[PDB]
Amino acid sequence: GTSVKPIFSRDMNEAKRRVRELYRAWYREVPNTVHLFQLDISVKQGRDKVREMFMKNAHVTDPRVVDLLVIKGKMELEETINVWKQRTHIMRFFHETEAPRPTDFLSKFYVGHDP
Amino acid sequence: QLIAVDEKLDITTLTGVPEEHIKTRKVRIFVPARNNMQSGVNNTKKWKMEFDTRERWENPLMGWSSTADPLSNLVLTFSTKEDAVAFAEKNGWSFDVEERKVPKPKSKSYGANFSWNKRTRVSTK
Amino acid sequence: PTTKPPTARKYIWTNHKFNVSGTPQQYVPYSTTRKKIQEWVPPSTPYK
Amino acid sequence: GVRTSPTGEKVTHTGQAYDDGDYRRVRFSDRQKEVNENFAIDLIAEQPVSEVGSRVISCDGGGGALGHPRVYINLDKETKTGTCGYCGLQFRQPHH
Amino acid sequence: NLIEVFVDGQSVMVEPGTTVLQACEKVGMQIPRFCYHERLSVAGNCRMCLVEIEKAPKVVAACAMPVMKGWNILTNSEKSKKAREGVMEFLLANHPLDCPICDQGGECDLQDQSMMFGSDRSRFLEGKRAVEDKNIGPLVKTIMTRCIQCTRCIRFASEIAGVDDLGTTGRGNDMQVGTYIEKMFMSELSGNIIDICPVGALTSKPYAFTARPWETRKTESIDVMDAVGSNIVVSTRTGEVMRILPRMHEDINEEWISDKTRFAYDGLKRQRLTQPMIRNEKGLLTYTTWEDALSRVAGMLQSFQGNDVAAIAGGLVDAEALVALKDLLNRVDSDSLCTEEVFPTAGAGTDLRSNYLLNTTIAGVEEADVILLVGTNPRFEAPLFNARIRKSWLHNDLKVALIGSPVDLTYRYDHLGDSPKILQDIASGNHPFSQILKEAKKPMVVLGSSALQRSDGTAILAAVSNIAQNIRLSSGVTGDWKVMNILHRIASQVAALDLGYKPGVEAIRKNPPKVLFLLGADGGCITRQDLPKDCFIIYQGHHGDVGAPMADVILPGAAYTEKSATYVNTEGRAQQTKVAVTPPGLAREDWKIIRALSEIAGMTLPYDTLDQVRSRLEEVSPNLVRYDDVEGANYFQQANELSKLVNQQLLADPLVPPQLTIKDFYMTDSISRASQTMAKCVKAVTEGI
Amino acid sequence: KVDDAKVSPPKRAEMKTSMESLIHHFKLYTEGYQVPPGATYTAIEAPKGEFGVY
Amino acid sequence: LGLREIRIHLCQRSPGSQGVRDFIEKRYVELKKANPDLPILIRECSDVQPKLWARYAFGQEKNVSLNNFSADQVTRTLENVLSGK
Amino acid sequence: TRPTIRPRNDVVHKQLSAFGQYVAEILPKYVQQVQVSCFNELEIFIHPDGVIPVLTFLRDHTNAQFKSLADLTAVDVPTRQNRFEIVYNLLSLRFNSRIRVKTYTDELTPIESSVTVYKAANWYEREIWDMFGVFFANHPDLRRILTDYGFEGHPFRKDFPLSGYVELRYDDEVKRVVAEPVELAQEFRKFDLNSPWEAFPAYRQPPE
Ligand code: SF4
Ligand code: SF4
Ligand code: FES
Ligand SMILES: [Mg+2]
Ligand SMILES: [Zn+2]
Structure with missing residues (x-):
């Protein structure tokens, strides 16, 4: 439909405002997450990971998609603040046990049939 | 009032699929071919969307067929080619569309088996 | 069994075996099918 | 009738036996290979051939409801026996 | 005009002479049937299709009764349901209990129609009938107790395959379908009786007992065993090619496939190249x-350049691999690129597609009035093309005329000599067949590409082009009808020609190469005797037949069931085969191997994905990426004018096809040679019994 | 069980002596019976309360 | 500098290739007879503009758009490629 | 009599049809369609923005006292423009009856939360969100209920694979459970069970 129902934020400006508010909320939480969960990472590493997770959705140009993304981000944050998660999930954000997947054509050709 | 989004729909960031299986997957939208072993045509009514085939290897123990592709068994049913194309586009996968093949109408006549001067006459019944 | 002995078959085991787990007599699984793909065998005679 | 491979490993009734250079033979070290010593092909060969004076015979495997579904075997080709394939049982018309 | 009938009260407009079954199909109802096949004649004996007309007191066989004006067809009426139940009851009353041991199993029309239209209980309290099994070859396994005497195999045999060795012997309940003698039903189209047999009486013998229909995964790909480009379906199970089935394409395949396509899938499991190989x-x-391996090949490629680099393309190569190899060889200014099949390069040559394409499509044969075959055996070179010719012959009294060797085609044809002297005479007009062609409204001239392999292929091509020109001049020039045609017998030939490969290995023979890339080249046209001493050979392929024994480096590759690839058939239509399984062991995709070799050599190619390689294919020739389209431009005037300028003399040798018999049909290429079933077929047709 | 061999399996003796019964047993244990299109919500008084299935 | 092959892509139905089709119709035979050993590959396009590819030595290729050209324009462009100017 | 055929209830069918007409007349603004299945189950298809008014009417109206929210779920149909189909099953104890209310929505369109009408809607809508990705506007606490913490994707969608994309195991190097891409020792075997012969003539569709 031409007149799509907005979740909120109307245009993209208010969506960006909500994105920045959620980013501030996550940024001020990383020291507490490191302290409580007794993570062995640095605070800088946690902030960098929050920044990277925010940046992987930087190409979104739909206000409704942005609103859903910030809703799910707030959900993830409230999981972390209430210590509902464990160190398991917080470290699952880091993919610490995966082998470095090759990205060049020659290495992909050598390892297997993966495109 | 009600906002307007003059852009193509895209829910790839919300579906949760990994980027590898979003970018490097080419689905196939088509109407399945009739199973040649049967004359029934009721399985060639709806369009189907299926993914490309990935590697399967042999399990070192018990010799089973292992896999590493999550979307190996994922087949979706769509009533129309347009519906399937829209779904594939909004989910971000590549897609190849194949047009439905319907048999051409044919002229059948029982009396052609006994033609007076044509080769259509049959030598047995 | 003393009053009603079971039917005797030529394939039924004569000696019963208990649970042999934890012993060198334990069951070990394996594939019961042969090799699907035959590899090409290059000639033993050099071409030159 | 079990047979021994050149690597010393018994062959099953399906002909399964790892090659000499196969690493998977290590699983049987300090343990045993589960092989059934009774071969159905050998046993059914041991079974004789029945002779009935009719063109068509009916086989259900014996026992009635305990056997296989009833099938009919046509005993017209005298150069070979008619084999019920559910149970692999051979029937034959009395020639001569 | 169309008449108006009714199906369950719904108005349908149908042509006069349309059957009740066809009217119901048009409205959307598939009437149950056993003996009826749309591609076969109308038999009307199984009586399963009986339906009720609204006022008629008697049910009518829907497969044979033409509709009349104002007929209301009651498909789901009580009378129709009772008739279907009775017919199914008789069929299953005499049918045997073999479902668990019967390969038809879960894809049986008798089972499905019993479950959808018949009762669920048996009133048969008597003994059943047992029928002696027959033996009709190593391909079809017959358990004739399961036959329902639907006469599909007999009708198919006679009408389609032109072989009348099947029929019914005796009468009554003792009627049996077979040969009545120990004769094998050996033909290049004998698997379609397996396909169309509604019950498990006729089943595939190589596929026997292996799998069940619900387990198989169906991958829709195409065929590469010949140049017809038949549409097939590969049935796999746990990553293994289990079966090959036809896929309907009425303009190419039409639900039928040849036996080489159907039963040579087992050749993909033997003599396979699985790892890269070098020489110690x-x-x-x-x-x-x-x-x-790639380091050695790249070192040699860097060492040499110029016309000292050659590639020989085999018969099962794809457009992606061909274009990748062409670009790789052009990166070193090398141009000794050739295919192992000769096409006359004098005049237009490969410049015009309407000079080596089958200009009238396979479906266009049904419209032709007269057809003239020159130096070919379509029964074995392209069995489905021969089947289409047979269909046109039967249904239109087509006048088939064959110049050269009197092969056993499946229909009556006019045999014109054995030498191209008749070909010259027809062009001149002395032969009466010149008058026949001139009077014919729609003539067609098909020159088999097997005749172009002769030393005077250019002269034969010029002669047939002159015949087509004479036809065009005398007849009306106006019209979209195309006369001149070339019938190919190699899957990769048309794609290679479109890309720009030089046909035949004459360039290699003229200038021997220091480095030779055999890309699936198992034809044996070029050997180390022709090549200079210390020549470096890299064979890239999926089977080790000739090139692998005579190569210095061996690169395993993928088959047509194992790669997504582009093949162009003899009429110019492009098609893509999809991935059914993955290449075994360390084998990789062909274009991927070529691209990796280029990257190691330092002359990296500009494509890294299948989409980019097909974009390169589009750059070279967009017809390679327009898949289902077959229409193209006609440049016969230019081709004929260029062929006229240079002329040579026809050899005084009779035209003999390479394949004169069904054994020669069975053994043609690498997969067939590696197949056990093809070897069994060859033994059966040579030694008999 | 409902005396409808297109829904419920027949007896072993009927399967091993009747062609229709064998066919129906095969189809019921390989493909299963087809259920006409439609949606239902049926609830019962299970011991823990209303247990329902849609 | 060293030409290796030349390819012409012309859509069959689109009016933009009317001039290109004229060159093939009544000028190709003279051109090919002038260059017997030059591969001139004629192919068809679907909806893209007509194009003229020229593959030189060591895999160097250039494409020239032939949209809305006439028979004279196509002849002059092809002569320019053959000449090297 | 037919022992194997379920008997029909014309009385209940007529009562349900009359009540469907009643509600359709009362609320023309939202009621798009009314149906009564042949096994006596009333269904009402309404516009998605009428959920609160329709549920409040069916709960508080004297002639429709559907006090109990029996069930609340969603059905995913990818071929539709609005794939998600929200279903409410209501029970009326006073009149001893059941009703069904069906609305439609897609990924990005919220559905008004019905926790002000029935309290069970809280957890039911939490489950709907967790399993399909449908967002409910005024939910007191909307979060995952059944999936793992930090789980990505909504499992019950038709396009979500059966085994998912990740699997868990204990990694001794990091002394914790880790999530790694899914990899099955034996792949799930897909069976094609549909027969190619039409089973029910009554449900045949026009060929179009
Ligand atoms: S042909 Fe059909 S009905 Fe007959 S035994 Fe085979 S599966 Fe059963
Ligand atoms: S063998 Fe098969 S195709 Fe031939 S008549 Fe019998 S049932 Fe029909
Ligand atoms: S289908 Fe008509 S009688 Fe057989
Ligand atoms: Mg069959
Ligand atoms: Zn038996």
């Missing part, structure tokens, strides 16, 4: 790594 100090081939 003693000259014996040993397995190695991709890195080492």
Whole structure:
């Protein structure tokens, strides 16, 4: 439909405002997450990971998609603040046990049939 | 009032699929071919969307067929080619569309088996 | 069994075996099918 | 009738036996290979051939409801026996 | 005009003469049937299709009764349901209990129609009938107790395959379908009786007992065993090619496939190349790594350049691999690129597609009035093209005329001599067949590409082009009808020609190469005797037949069931085969191997994905990426004018096809030679019994 | 069980002596019976309360 | 500098290739007879503009758009490629 | 009599049809369609923005006292423009009856939360969100209920694979459970069970 129902934020400006508010909320939480969960990472590493997770959705140009993304981000944050998660999930954000997947054509050709 | 989004729909960031299986997957939208072993045509009514085939290897123990592709068994049913194309586009996968093949109408006549001067006459019944 | 002995078959085991787990007599699984793909065998005679 | 491979490993009734250079033979070290010593092909060969004076015979495997579904075997080709394939049982018309 | 009938009260407009079954199909109802096949004649004996007309007191066989004006067809009426139940009851009353041991199993029309239209209980309290099994070859396994005497195999045999060795012997309940003698039903189209037999009486013998229909995964790909490009379906199970089935394409395949296509899938499991191979100090081939093999090949490629680099393309190569190899060889200014099949390069040559394409499509044969076959055996070179010719012959009284060797075609044809002297005479007009062609409204001239392999292929091509020109001049020039045609017999030939490969290995023979890339080249046209001493050979392929024994480096590749690839058939239509399984062992995709070799050599190619390689294919020739389209431009005037300028003399040798018999049909290429079933077929047709 | 061999399996003796019964047993244990299109919500008084299935 | 092959892509139905089709119709035979050993590959396009590819030595290729050209324009462009100017 | 055929209830069918007409007349603004299945189950298809008014009417109206929210779920149909189909099953104890209310929505369109009408809607809508990705506007606490913490994707969608994309195991190097891409020792075997012969003539569709 031409007149799509907005979740909120109307245009993209208010969506960006909500994105920045959620980013501030996550940024001020990383020291507490490191302290409580007794993570062995640095605070800088946690902030960098929050920044990277925010940046992987930087190409979104739909206000409704942005609103859903910030809703799910707030959900993830409230999981972390209430210590509902464990160190398991917080470290699952880091993919610490995966082998470095090759990205060049020659290495992909050598390892297997993966495109 | 009600906002307007003059852009193509895209829910790839919300579906949760990994980027590898979003970018490097080419689905196939088509109407399945009739199973040649049967004359029934009721399985060639709806369009189907299926993914490309990935590697399967042999399990070192018990010799089973292992896999590493999550979307190996994922087949979706769509009533129309347009519906399937829209779904594939909004989910971000590549897609190849194949047009439905319907048999051409044919002229059948029982009396052609006994033609007076044509080769259509049959030598047995 | 003393009053009603079971039917005797030529394939039924004569000696019963208990649970042999934890012993060198334990069951070990394996594939019961042969090799699907035959590899090409290059000639033993050099071409030159 | 079990047979021994050149690597010393018994062959099953399906002909399964790892090659000499196969690493998977290590699983049987300090343990045993589960092989059934009774071969159905050998046993059914041991079974004789029945002779009935009719063109068509009916086989259900014996026992009635305990056997296989009833099938009919046509005993017209005298150069070979008619084999019920559910149970692999051979029937034959009395020639001569 | 169309008449108006009714199906369950719904108005349908149908042509006069349309059957009740066809009217119901048009409205959307598939009437149950056993003996009825749309591609076969109308038999009307199984009586399963009986339906009720609204006022008629008697049910009518829907497969044979033409509709009349104002007929209301009651498909789901009580009378129709009772008739279907009775017919199914009789069929299953005499049918045997073999479902668990019967390969038809879960894809049985008798089972499905019993479950959808018949009762669920048996009133048969008597003994059943047992029928002696027959033996009609190593391909079809017959358990004739399961036959329902639907006469599909007989009708198919006669009408389609032109072989009348099947029929019913005796009468009554003792009627049996077979040969009545120990004769094998050996023909190049004998698997379609397996396909169309509604019950398990006729089943595939190589596929016997292996799998069940619900387990198989169906991958829709195409065929590469010949140049017809038949549409097939590969049935796999746990990553293994289990079966090959026809896929309907009425303009190419039409639900039928040849036996070589259907039963040579087992050749993909033997003599397979699975690891890269090099040669040690003693000259014996040993397995190695991709890195080492590609490093050696890249070192040689960097060492040499110019026309000292050659590629020979085999018969099962794809457009992606061909274009990748062409670009790789052009990166070193080398141009000794050739295919192992000769096409006359004098005049237009490969410049015009309407000079080596089958200008009238396969479906266009049904519209032709007269057809003239020159130097070909379509029964074995392209069995489905011959089947289409047979269909046109039967249903239109087509006048088939064959110049040259009197092969056993499946229909009556006019045999014109054995030499191209008749070909010259027809062009001149002395032969009466010149008058026949001139009077014919729609003539067609098909020159088999097997005749172009002769030393005077250019002269034969010029002669047939002159015949087509004479036809065009005398007849009306106006019209979209195309006369001149070339029938190919190699899957990769048309794609290679479109890309720009020089046909035939004459360039290699003229200038021997220091480095030779055999891309699936198992034809044996070029050997180390022709090549100079210390020549470096890299064979890239999926089977080790000739090139692998005579190569220095061996690169395993993928088959048509194992790669997504582009093949162009003899009429110019492009098609893509999809991935059914993955290449075994360390084998990789062909274009991927070529691209990796280029990257190691330092002349990296500009494509890294299948989409980019097909974009390169589009750059070279967009017809390679327009898939289902077959229409093209006609440049016969230019081709004929260029062929006229240079002329040579026809050899005084009779035209003899390479394949004169069904054994020659069975053994044609690498997969067929590696197949066990093809060897069994050859033994059966040679030694008999 | 409902005396409808297109829904419920027949007896072993009927399967091993009747062609229709064998066919129906095969189809019921390989493909299963087809259920006409439609949606239902049926609830019962299970011991823990209303247990329902949609 | 060293030409290796030349390819012409012309859509069959689109009016933009009317001039290109004229060159093939009544000028190709003279051109090919002038260059017997030059591969001139004629192919068809679907909806893209007509194009003229020229593959030189060591895999160097250039494409020239032939949209809305006439028979004279196509002849002059092809002569320019053959000449090297 | 037919022992194997379920008997029909014309009385209940007529009562349900009359009540469907009643509600359709009362609320023309939202009621798009009314149906009564042949096994006596009333269904009402309404516009998605009428959920609160329709549920409040069916709960508080004297002639429709559907006090109990029996069930609340969603059905995913990818071929539709609005794939998600929200279903409410209501029970009326006073009149001893059941009703069904069906609305439609897609990924990005919220559905008004019905926790002000029935309290069970809280957890039911939490489950709907967790399993399909449908967002409910005024939910007191909307979060995952059944999936793992930090789980990505909504499992019950038709396009979500059966085994998912990740699997868990204990990694001794990091002394914790880790999530790694899914990899099955034996792949799930897909069976094609549909027969190619039409089973029910009554449900045949026009060929179009
Ligand atoms: S042909 Fe059909 S009905 Fe007959 S035994 Fe085979 S599966 Fe059963
Ligand atoms: S063998 Fe098969 S195709 Fe031939 S008549 Fe019998 S049932 Fe029909
Ligand atoms: S289908 Fe008509 S009688 Fe057989
Ligand atoms: Mg069959
Ligand atoms: Zn038996």
